[PDB]
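Hello everyone,

My group is preparing for a crystallization screen and wants a predicted model to guide construct design. The compound we'll soak is calcium ion. Before spending weeks at the bench, it would help to have a computed complex in hand. I've included the protein sequence and the ligand's SMILES below. Output in structure-token form would be ideal because that's what our pipeline reads.
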Amino acid sequence: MGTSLFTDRATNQLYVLLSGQLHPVYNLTSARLVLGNPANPATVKSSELSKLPMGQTVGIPGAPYATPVSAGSTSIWTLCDTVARADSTSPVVQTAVIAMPLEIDASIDPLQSHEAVLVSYQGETWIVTTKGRHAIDLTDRALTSSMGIPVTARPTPISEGMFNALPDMGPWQLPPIPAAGAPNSLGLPDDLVIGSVFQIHTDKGPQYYVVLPDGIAQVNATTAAALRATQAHGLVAPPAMVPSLVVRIAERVYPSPLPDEPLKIVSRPQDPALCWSWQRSAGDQSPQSTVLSGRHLPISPSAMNMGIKQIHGTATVYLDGGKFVALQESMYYIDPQGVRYGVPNAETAKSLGLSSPQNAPWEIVRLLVDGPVLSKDAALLEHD
Ligand SMILES: [Ca+2]
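Reply:
Good plan to model first. Here are the tokens for the complex, ready for your pipeline.
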């Protein structure tokens, strides 16, 4: 009848009452687990512990001592790839995860819809925009130069977690023109064959169109340039057309991922930080995935002194206190050291006094060190 948890004065070790007699315990977490409620230990003179038929140690060894947690408000989760020696041989990428509010400026901001990051992963190159990653080839020497980028710009390494965090928004590459070259069946000049590009001067500059088998397709100047570079069909300049010719021809759509603006390949030495931010204010809404580029980590210079390089881990963890997170659900507790411990059922977390687990992206939380699983079965193992 108590009271069921005690601490010594000389050693301050935790003791829990089991049915009739007490057992010592590795951590407070295991005690609050085996009890089923978040109660605090009672400091006690060693002689009290002495005059008692003691059992032996139970609980979970590699479990966190306690389970403290910060607040929210926001559930911010960022994953940054910083790069050292961005012109070596022999380069190296230092990655990091952030679960604290960010300090975003103009030296580390999300990519504008015209700038992108050349990247390399598993022998195959990719390109990163605000949306995600797109497959690309840097071997076809001329094919690369068709869109702003040269070959004098080489890609740069990227971590696995970063690669898997970026949604594969397909490849770059202008869509296939299956009938390209065949006599145009729309009445236009025969030298303006299918797959050719022509221009019409509207009220806001010229407008470029590709001759498709089932009509004509509006494209941005970059797509026009790329198409012409691939195949111009014996045409020096895209033949100017006057509106009243195609004003009656069926208008069609041509995907083309190329931006209307020119392409600004960021300089990884001058812009080493490549991050993926994930947000959820409070309302249901949807997660807000955005890719950032910059000079440094999107946190305060002070926060840089909070980086816990995971000893047997993958990334440096920047963390403002403990977190209680829910994926998908599958729930986890993150200790201030940046280690995820599995929290099974909803009834279990009530013992640790944990409530309202924030939503967090599994893409980021999975990079955290997977510790033991906080369960009642695992917390019932005797040791000498
Ligand atoms: Ca920028």
